[PDB]
Design a protein around this nucleic acid. Sequence first.
RNA 1: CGUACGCGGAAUACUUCGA
RNA 2: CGUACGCGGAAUACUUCGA
Lengths: 121, 121
Amino acid sequence: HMTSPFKLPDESPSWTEWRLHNDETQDNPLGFKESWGFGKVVFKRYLRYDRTEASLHRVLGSWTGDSVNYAASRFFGFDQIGCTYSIRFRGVSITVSGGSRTLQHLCEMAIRSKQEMLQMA
Amino acid sequence: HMTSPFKLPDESPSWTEWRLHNDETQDNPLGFKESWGFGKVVFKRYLRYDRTEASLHRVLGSWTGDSVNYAASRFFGFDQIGCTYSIRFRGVSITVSGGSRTLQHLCEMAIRSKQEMLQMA
RNA sequence: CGUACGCGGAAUACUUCGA
RNA sequence: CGUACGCGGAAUACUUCGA
């Protein structure tokens, strides 16, 4: 059981729920997918999002600079390792990548990209 | 001679200039690298940037939604193609990717990521 | 700054198979 | 929504070679 950088559990819909949603509505999916990779390990999350202020606040809390650093530090070594944050929403994907030594900046760019991605008209 | 999505020419420093800059100063490079890829074709640019308002204004003009769409449309076909914008600055890289059908949104996210990247403390 | 290459990881696009 | 795979492209990290 590795330590995840996420503070909220995964919310992936079952194949059935996904199908039901499809027949009900795309630019209106159940949510978005985001991931954090440290070296050879990747952690993923699908989170429900409905474009409301309440929902945006909730999902922006899925990870923080501190939770990412704590999870990432477990994989640090003599040499620098590759770190990456990815988020996909409505057909568009943004990936922020860099070496572990720039993790702080990586997280700053990651959270900003996340907010902009979710607040896309 | 293919049509580039860029409106400013490349400014890659020679090996000599780069070396001279190194001995003079990293979080203070001569500039940043950005690229636009449409299908199997990629266009690249290294642009000088000194963190000033004047410089930021200048480099944000290297491409627009219109110049990207005109360059990208040359590669459109029956099926959708993969499009990508990448920018690297001070050890951090941001890549915005998606299918050609989302190019408009891709460009919106790309320009925002570019501005945030260049205005990183 | 740039060139060629290898490994790992990742992203996107198209296609297909499986629930 | 998810799984496995192939091709192309791309990104990052480490290493090395070449200017």
